[PDB]
Amino acid sequence: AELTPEVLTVPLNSEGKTITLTEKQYLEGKRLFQYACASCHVGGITKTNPSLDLRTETLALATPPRDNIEGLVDYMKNPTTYDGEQEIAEVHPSLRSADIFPKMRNLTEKDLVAIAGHILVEPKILGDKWGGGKVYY
Amino acid sequence: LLFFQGFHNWTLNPFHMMGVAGVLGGALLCAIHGATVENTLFQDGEGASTFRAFNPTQAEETYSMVTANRFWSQIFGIAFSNKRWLHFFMLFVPVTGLWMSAIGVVGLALNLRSYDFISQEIRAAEDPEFETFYTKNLLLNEGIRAWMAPQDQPHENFVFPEEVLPRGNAL
Amino acid sequence: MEVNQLGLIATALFVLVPSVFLIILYVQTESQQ
Amino acid sequence: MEVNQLGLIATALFVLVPSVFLIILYVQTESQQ
Amino acid sequence: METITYVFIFACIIALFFFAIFFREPPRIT
Amino acid sequence: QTLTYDDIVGTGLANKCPTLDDTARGAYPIDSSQTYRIARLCLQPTTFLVKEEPKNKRQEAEFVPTKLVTRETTSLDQIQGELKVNSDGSLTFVEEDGIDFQPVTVQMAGGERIPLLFTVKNLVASTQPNVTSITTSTDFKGEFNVPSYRTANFLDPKGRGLASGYDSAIALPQAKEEELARANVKRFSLTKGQISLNVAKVDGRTGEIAGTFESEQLSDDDMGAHEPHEVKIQGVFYASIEPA
Amino acid sequence: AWKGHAVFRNKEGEELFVRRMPAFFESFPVILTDKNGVVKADIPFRRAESKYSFEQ
Amino acid sequence: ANLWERFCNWVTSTDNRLYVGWFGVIMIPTLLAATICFVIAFIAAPPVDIDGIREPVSGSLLYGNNIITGAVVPSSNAIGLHFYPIWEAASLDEWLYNGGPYQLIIFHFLLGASCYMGRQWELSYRLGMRPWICVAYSAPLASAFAVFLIYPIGQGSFSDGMPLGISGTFNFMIVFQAEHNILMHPFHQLGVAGVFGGALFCAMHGSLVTSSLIRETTETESANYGYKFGQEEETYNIVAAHGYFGRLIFQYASFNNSRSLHFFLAAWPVVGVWFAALGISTMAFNLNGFNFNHSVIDAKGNVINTWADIINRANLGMEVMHERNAHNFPLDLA
Amino acid sequence: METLKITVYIVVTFFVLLFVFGFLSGDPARNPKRKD
Amino acid sequence: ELVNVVDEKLGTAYGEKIDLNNTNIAAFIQYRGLYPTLAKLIVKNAPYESVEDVLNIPGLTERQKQILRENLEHFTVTEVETALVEGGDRYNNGLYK
Amino acid sequence: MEPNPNRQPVELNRTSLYLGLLLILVLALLFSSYFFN
Amino acid sequence: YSLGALSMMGFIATCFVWFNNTVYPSEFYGPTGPEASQAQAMTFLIRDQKLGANVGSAQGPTGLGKYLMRSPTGEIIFGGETMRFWDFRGPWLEPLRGPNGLDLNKIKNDIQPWQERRAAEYMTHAPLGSLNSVGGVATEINSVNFVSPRSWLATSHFVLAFFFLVGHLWHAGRARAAAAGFEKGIDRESEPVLSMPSLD
Ligand code: CLA
Ligand code: CLA
Ligand code: CLA
Ligand code: CLA
Ligand code: CLA
Ligand SMILES: CC(C)=CCC/C(C)=C/CC/C(C)=C/CC/C(C)=C/CC/C(C)=C/CC/C(C)=C/CC/C(C)=C/CC/C(C)=C/CC/C(C)=C/CC1=CC(=O)C(C)=C(C)C1=O
Ligand code: HEC
Ligand SMILES: CCCCCCCCCCCCO[C@@H]1O[C@H](CO)[C@@H](O[C@H]2O[C@H](CO)[C@@H](O)[C@H](O)[C@H]2O)[C@H](O)[C@H]1O
Ligand SMILES: CCCCCCCCCCCCO[C@@H]1O[C@H](CO)[C@@H](O[C@H]2O[C@H](CO)[C@@H](O)[C@H](O)[C@H]2O)[C@H](O)[C@H]1O
Ligand code: OEX
Ligand SMILES: [Cl-]
Ligand SMILES: [Cl-]
Ligand SMILES: [Fe+2]
């Protein structure tokens, strides 16, 4: 098995358009995920709130849907609760709270797309391992 | 090693225990005999590094058996006084232990385990407040079997759904 | 506890039988000239 | 039959304890000069 | 019976320690 | 003069209800139109008594004294709730929230440990009627809930529990279940307990009342594996009344 | 006596098969599959998120 | 001589059947205190709430255990690292419930066993020996400090010390592997090399000396009567033994210097057990054994399992099951 | 409990003082060779 | 006889739906719009005599009612099982990952 | 320390062995029924 | 004598770095072992209270309070396994403490977002990691490259303090023997034990 274009094609937005990531931005996304996110979201779970994970099916039921690149990027700019009712930037890392989350400081838009790509690609690779926790280790 | 804990409860097996005693007793004898010889050496030369004072063609003992005996009799109560018995016992201890463990493994070939103490299982089944370190180990063993068997025995095609896996609270 | 009914006799003989064997051989050694 | 649970060990020791006592004294007598 | 048996065997071992230490065959230099 | 955590820590004073000077023999006027509130109710047990079980049916089923073995972990504190003046000028206390339970283990003569969930959970306690002032003669009397001492996720040593765990004895794969059924099938008890709080000292100015209590409740039944004992708990209380 | 052969069926009428204990296992979970080895029912350990229970 | 000078001469007397000494004046009361309490606790102590969760574990013979399952249970998790002597308890029944005997035993034991090391130095000095038997003993001593004291300190509770019983020992080992992957830690691996090698070298040295015993006896008697206690002559032919073992392997693989040989027999298990003790004592601060879980990834990114991944499944099974009612939050942090 | 605490404190102090004063009591000179 | 009440409740609609009287709050993540705001309000204002009593929680906005009305098909009500509601188990039942 | 001069050798001849064993076995055979009861 | 002193100091430094968050500030060295375990109980207290839970009255599986319980001297402390670490003191936690320990009214009302961020950060940076620097428990997958400085500093200095204890014993015994004059072995002519009465 290889890391094909078809593995690397993820929904760009919610209307239906897709983007195909390169292997270089997949691997930059995994590096930037590990650097900025994996302390809480190793393997696609969430250590500090295990009820919510990074499975695509959970990201799809979020409000607004986060199961596409534009939805994931917007979360990294202005994170909300799962229903979209409260902005949670004072307790979740984001670009608007990069003063209190200093690892968010120099992330560019290409960096957020790369992280968003890694979050969407990784379940297509790992299956239920992504977001499944220790049962699937 | 972890298969034998989880499936055979091999730590509970008295033949393995005899093996452990022979291995650890062997390493103890190795350490103590070496250290005893090195610290009861006769001064046979002028160097502070004392290895040069030995010659393989010497007839004389290089260390004082009498001093070693007096030392150990006063420290530990008993001591060797026969060098031949001492060295035989050093053969005997690790060799007997390994033989004992081999006998245990032969039993485990047929799943003839020392898995459980029947009297504690009867009591634990009827008295939900009775808990021992043996009962705790059995739960650990049940975790090992369930969490490892699907990937450790892939010929079986075990599908253990997440709800059947034994887990304690939270973890 | 509900233990094996033969465990006491099995343990008592496992002790007593080789222990008395060694005692017999010890005592008759001491009595030799 | 529903017998005393200690009857076997009581009988086994009642045999074995004085029997081994006599054997010890016999054997060490034979080994004297 | 079990508890008595274990303690009995243990107590014999402690007694054997006593004899092995204080009533050993004395090491004699010859 | 008012202590901090560094003065309190390790001394055992944290397990004590606060007291009132002997001068505070006052009265707290209850205005029958105002809403009041308990800002902090603290119950400090001093005595645990357990009823014995005579195998006879008859005999004197007396409460016997027990020794605490789980150390200074016994007080309920920071309990709040509304104090609703009723029609007749009786006050009813509706427990809302706080540290309103403590597992306690006591030991009887002979070594029997008795675990109990010492609690005032969902306390609804009422006074007498016609009480315009909380006085040193007021007596709150009330009923509370005693949930199961273990909750539903608790696993026994053989891995059996209620919401989790095995439902059988896995060590005896071919034993007859029907006598293991009381140990195999876990059950969550929910019982009622009965408390009477006797006001002894009122700081009528501040609104701090203090007194004694007596509580009667069942001990733990070990998820239904055995019968619980009747336990009587006696101690002291402190409450602070505050107009909401 | 032989109690006879037990045939397990779900509420949809499909025959289930209990996965048998291998000899290695002092204890084994109760897992019921269809004829294609897909898990259809079980006796779960944690009940709270169980989807395959015999009651369900 | 005054009474103090007479007492000092008694204490340091080499004529005492068992050497007392200054370390002995500490060792003797402490070890007697630890022994007596251990024996009484092992026989008769009531159940102990080891996990601080009002779930007492029965460790003693009178409470249903046999020799194999019985233990002196570690003190309660609610106590943590707090010093819990008898006087701190409101009653003996509370001290017993909370696992008081464990703290009393291990503290007297470790103090006593430290003085056993000093006493070994002391007698060697009085006898004119070289002083380093005590250094060899520092290996098992460090191991005892590791499991009874250092591990609890780094973990924050004497409830994580090794129980004083046989099955309790096994529980300690299994949980340790679950939480630290001790098998994959090179210090434990050096420990194993220390003990397997030590038993190997014990067998080898015993066998080579026994093989090279010089004939002084007939077939009808034990060859051990060929040696007389305190004889000046060597009782075995070390040149013959070297000539055998240097042909078994090759000539330069074999010791011909008995002093070098015996130093090696000392140093191998001792250095190996030191690494084992440091292993436990460094896993006390949660620097764990090697984690290769998901180290092998294919071209797509599929995890390819290795034997380390199979170990992790076993580790998970112990981890999810151990102390099954004690955890309230997702991560096992201490 | 207080009486037990004082008894252990006394006993422990007694044996510690024996150890310290005993090692202070010319310990290097208690050896079979150089009794300086 | 002696029955496991949690196992028995899996034979009811609790086994198939979100029981508003009993189900732990994390099951509201299964459908869009419930968690944590509406889920917190539903758990707090329980018990309910029917599912449609969930539209009587006071203070709900108009869009909040519309969310609940979309999701009435996924809700059920049973008897309050004390084994599921005591200890705060509706908020944290010790299940994580 | 000088040895103890009161020490004496002990003897049991073979016939005494046979008599004693006869005694012990017959007492065993006699009392065994009562010990089992 | 110096080796004995250095060993003692090494052991003290190991404890200093492991437990002390004053001269080893957690903002530089990461949370202590106790600090992270306390930070986890706090994190889930905060999350569950935000969902509507009454944290002072929640029973855990054993009957002890799931979030809050009493220490053996009555102070209100975090529950679960972190009951062992109730003596932890840290600047992010001390504003929740009252006279009787953790104050339930301050917990309901006065947890700031900076404390919520700090608790989550500390819980996810516990000093637990593998020798190849994989962060978290031994059962964790590879992803996070983390071993806390406190773990590196404590482990190193325990190792060093121990061998320096061994060195003290080596050199103290040798200096004693060399001063008395038997460090090179027993003199064959005046072997001391042969001038002693037999023990039995
Ligand atoms: C105190 C801890 C301890 C100790 C001291 C032991 C000791 C032992 N274990 Mg036990 N074990 C333990 C804990 C312990 N165990 C625990 C907690 C478990 C979990 C249940 C186990 C699980 C376990 C299992 C599953 C087994 C053991 C076995 C044994 C025995 C191994 C003997 C041996 O040397 O094999 C080593 C191998 C040999 C001696 C064979 C000969 C090797 C040849 C000669 C080597 C040739 C090398 C060649 C020249 C060069 C190689 C190339 C090189 C590059 C490598 C020994 C008695 C084994 C046993 O009982 O066997 C009978 C066994 O199978 N143990
Ligand atoms: C060699 C004698 C000896 C020693 C060292 C100990 C040591 C101990 N006992 Mg034990 N004990 C002993 C004999 C001893 N015991 C005897 C004979 C009995 C029967 C009466 C007991 C009965 C007993 C019980 C019932 C208990 C103890 C407990 C203790 C522990 C705490 C004691 C304490 O807090 O004192 C306070 C310390 C002092 C007063 C120190 C003063 C010493 C000098 C003056 C100061 C120098 C200190 C400094 C460290 C320098 C040391 C010298 C160094 C440089 C070499 C401690 C490990 C308790 C325990 O085990 O808790 C878990 C406990 O409950 N003991
Ligand atoms: C107090 C001593 C100390 C401590 C706590 C650390 C800690 C650290 N170092 Mg540093 N470092 C040190 C001394 C220390 N180092 C020394 C002496 C050197 C020169 C070699 C370095 C050079 C160095 C480099 C180049 C790097 C680090 C890095 C690191 C970090 C990761 C280490 C790692 O992955 O280890 C891997 C674990 C090992 C290699 C195991 C070593 C086990 C030792 C050798 C056992 C010692 C036993 C004893 C001394 C000998 C016993 C013998 C017996 C017979 C008596 C960690 C913070 C890395 C980093 O992250 O930088 C930012 C990094 O790149 N260190
Ligand atoms: C591989 C060898 C090795 C390495 C790399 C280290 C490395 C380290 N050790 Mg370790 N140590 C070692 C072996 C080693 N050690 C051994 C063998 C022992 C004995 C067992 C120790 C005992 C030891 C202790 C007890 C401690 C350390 C500590 C440390 C750390 C800081 C060292 C320091 O600042 O000292 C101090 C430096 C000096 C004493 C030199 C003088 C410095 C002057 C006085 C500083 C003045 C500054 C002042 C502010 C000036 C301002 C001027 C002003 C007017 C502006 C460092 C990581 C410390 C630590 O972090 O503990 C965890 C610590 O407490 N070590
Ligand atoms: C690990 C324990 C330990 C052991 C077995 C030894 C052993 C020895 N020490 Mg060393 N010592 C140690 C730790 C140890 N030491 C430490 C940590 C230091 C730094 C403070 C020293 C400082 C030191 C000096 C200055 C000297 C020795 C010397 C010696 C040697 C001669 C006897 C003597 O005077 O001892 C003294 C014993 C100690 C200082 C401590 C021994 C500790 C054990 C546990 C006994 C403690 C008993 C105590 C009374 C218990 C208190 C209990 C509590 C409840 C109050 C002997 C080999 C002497 C020597 O001849 O060197 C050439 C010498 O002059 N040691
Ligand atoms: C009722 C109560 C309280 C219960 C008790 C509690 C409890 C839990 C009990 C423990 C039960 C227990 C004993 C279990 C262990 C059972 C067990 C595993 C049995 C093993 C049995 C068995 C047959 C094993 C087979 C292998 C085997 C033979 C091992 C023997 C190991 C052994 C004895 C090794 C020797 C150890 C040792 C300390 C020897 C010291 C020798 C010594 C004095 C050397 C000194 C010395 C060195 C020299 O170099 C010179 C020159 C001289 C002169 C000299 O002197
Ligand atoms: C811990 C300190 C975290 C770090 C670092 C990051 N996240 Fe996170 N994340 C965290 C929590 C507690 C939550 C739940 C918040 C809530 O109350 O709703 C989240 C949530 C997300 C989500 C939404 C998941 C969903 O199912 O909708 C996403 C997509 C997400 N986080 C992404 C994300 C990224 C990309 C991060 C790195 C930059 C990151 N998180 C950091 C905790 C923590
Ligand atoms: C479980 C039941 C076990 C019960 C055990 C019964 C033990 C009985 C002990 C019998 C002991 C006989 O004790 C033994 O007596 C013989 C002679 O009789 C003594 O022997 C002595 O006298 C004989 C004959 O003069 C000499 O040859 C010999 O050299 C001398 O030592 C032994 O030195 C002494 O040890
Ligand atoms: C821990 C608390 C105590 C701290 C002690 C520190 C105080 C410092 C001065 C203490 C004095 C020690 O002084 C020491 O005393 C002893 C006993 O009295 C003297 O007297 C000793 O004489 C010789 C050796 O010299 C011994 O054989 C004899 O048994 C002993 O009486 C030592 O020769 C002297 O060196
Ligand atoms: O005590 Mn004993 O084992 Ca040490 O990790 Mn956390 O704490 Mn408990 O869980 Mn796992
Ligand atoms: Cl466990
Ligand atoms: Cl926990
Ligand atoms: Fe030898």
Side-chain angles (χ1 to χ4, degrees), chain A residues 45 50-53 55 60-63 65 81-83 85 131-132 135, chain J residues 26 28-38 63-64 67 95-97:
Chain A
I45 48 84
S51 307
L52 297 166
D53 50 49
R55 288 200 145 109
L61 286 162
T63 309
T81 46
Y82 196 66
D83 48 23
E85 298 270 16
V135 164
Chain J
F28 288 100
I29 301 173
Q30 284 174 254
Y31 314 100
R32 167 176 276 110
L34 306 185
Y35 184 93
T37 306
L38 280 169
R63 157 151 123 83
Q64 277 172 324
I67 294 169
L95 284 256
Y96 295 106
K97 279 283 191 197

Side-chain angles (χ1 to χ4, degrees), chain H residues 6-285:
Chain H
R6 291 178 57 211
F7 183 66
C8 281
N9 287 331
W10 177 79
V11 162
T12 65
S13 176
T14 68
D15 305 334
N16 283 331
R17 173 62 182 85
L18 296 177
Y19 178 73
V20 189
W22 300 114
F23 286 104
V25 318
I26 305 299
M27 185 198 74
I28 293 168
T30 47
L31 289 189
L32 285 174
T35 296
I36 288 168
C37 190
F38 172 78
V39 166
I40 292 161
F42 198 90
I43 294 171
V48 163
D49 181 28
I50 180 189
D51 290 301
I53 58 171
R54 320 296 172 84
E55 178 178 319
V57 172
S58 295
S60 62
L61 295 184
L62 290 178
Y63 287 79
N65 288 271
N66 60 26
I67 288 296
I68 296 303
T69 76
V72 178
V73 180
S75 51
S76 173
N77 187 45
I79 288 168
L81 292 184
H82 284 242
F83 179 58
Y84 193 61
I86 302 197
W87 53 91
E88 281 305 292
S91 68
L92 275 185
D93 300 299
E94 175 212 304
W95 186 74
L96 296 176
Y97 185 91
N98 291 288
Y102 184 78
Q103 283 201 16
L104 187 146
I105 295 155
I106 65 153
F107 292 163
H108 292 82
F109 171 73
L110 285 181
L111 190 37
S114 291
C115 294
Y116 191 97
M117 186 166 67
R119 174 169 167 273
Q120 286 182 336
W121 162 75
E122 194 178 338
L123 185 55
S124 77
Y125 187 62
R126 306 307 180 215
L127 298 181
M129 283 164 57
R130 277 141 60 80
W132 296 308
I133 287 169
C134 67
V135 177
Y137 180 63
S138 79
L141 183 57
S143 293
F145 272 92
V147 304
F148 291 138
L149 178 63
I150 308 303
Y151 191 73
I153 287 170
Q155 303 302 300
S157 184
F158 293 108
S159 71
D160 286 347
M162 184 180 90
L164 312 184
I166 288 163
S167 283
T169 293
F170 307 142
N171 189 78
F172 175 84
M173 301 178 74
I174 298 170
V175 172
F176 210 104
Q177 163 67 21
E179 257 140 32
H180 305 289
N181 205 4
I182 182 182
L183 299 182
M184 296 291 290
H185 194 295
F187 280 6
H188 182 269
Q189 299 163 359
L190 288 167
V192 170
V195 306
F196 279 169
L200 201 174
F201 301 146
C202 182
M204 204 70 208
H205 185 57
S207 67
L208 289 176
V209 173
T210 303
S211 301
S212 55
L213 292 188
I214 296 167
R215 178 185 312 126
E216 299 294 336
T217 53
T218 62
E219 199 225 340
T220 53
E221 63 185 300
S222 171
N224 296 342
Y225 291 108
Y227 175 83
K228 310 299 194 302
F229 176 66
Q231 75 177 52
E232 61 279 343
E233 295 90 344
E234 200 56 62
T235 203
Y236 68 105
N237 191 331
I238 196 178
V239 179
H242 176 52
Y244 169 80
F245 181 63
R247 281 172 178 88
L248 182 64
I249 314 301
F250 52 86
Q251 177 184 2
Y252 308 103
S254 171
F255 291 107
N256 54 276
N257 189 319
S258 180
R259 296 186 168 203
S260 283
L261 165 62
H262 285 89
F263 176 64
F264 182 75
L265 296 181
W268 187 281
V270 164
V271 171
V273 169
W274 280 340
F275 282 117
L278 290 166
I280 300 300
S281 305
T282 55
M283 292 172 258
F285 309 99

Side-chain angles (χ1 to χ4, degrees), chain B residues 169-171, chain H residues 77 325-333, chain L residues 37 40-41 66 79-83:
Chain B
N169 194 80
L171 316 182
Chain H
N77 187 45
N325 299 310
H327 310 93
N328 281 331
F329 305 119
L331 303 186
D332 191 17
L333 283 196
Chain L
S37 176
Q40 175 176 42
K66 179 183 302 182
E81 274 209 315
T82 203
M83 80 177 63

Side-chain angles (χ1 to χ4, degrees), chain F residues 148-189:
Chain F
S148 158
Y149 169 88
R150 310 297 198 182
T151 61
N153 276 29
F154 184 78
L155 302 170
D156 85 350
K158 293 316 286 172
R160 303 167 300 195
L162 178 53
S164 184
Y166 304 121
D167 63 307
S168 59
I170 65 171
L172 313 172
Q174 292 281 53
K176 290 297 197 191
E177 305 223 36
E178 55 270 53
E179 83 256 21
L180 299 161
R182 192 170 187 192
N184 285 347
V185 183
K186 305 308 191 186
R187 293 172 287 156
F188 197 90
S189 76

Side-chain angles (χ1 to χ4, degrees), chain C residues 5-6 8-9 12-13 16-17 20 23-25 27-29 31-33, chain D residues 5-6 8-9 12-13 16-17 20 23-25 27-29 31-33:
Chain C
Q5 300 302 127
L6 290 165
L8 180 61
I9 178 67
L13 296 181
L16 287 165
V17 175
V20 304
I23 293 163
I24 288 155
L25 289 179
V27 176
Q28 63 94 43
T29 306
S31 58
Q32 294 172 27
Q33 181 203 7
Chain D
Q5 300 302 127
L6 290 165
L8 180 61
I9 178 67
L13 296 181
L16 287 165
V17 175
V20 304
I23 293 163
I24 288 155
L25 289 179
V27 176
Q28 63 94 43
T29 306
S31 58
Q32 294 172 27
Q33 182 203 7

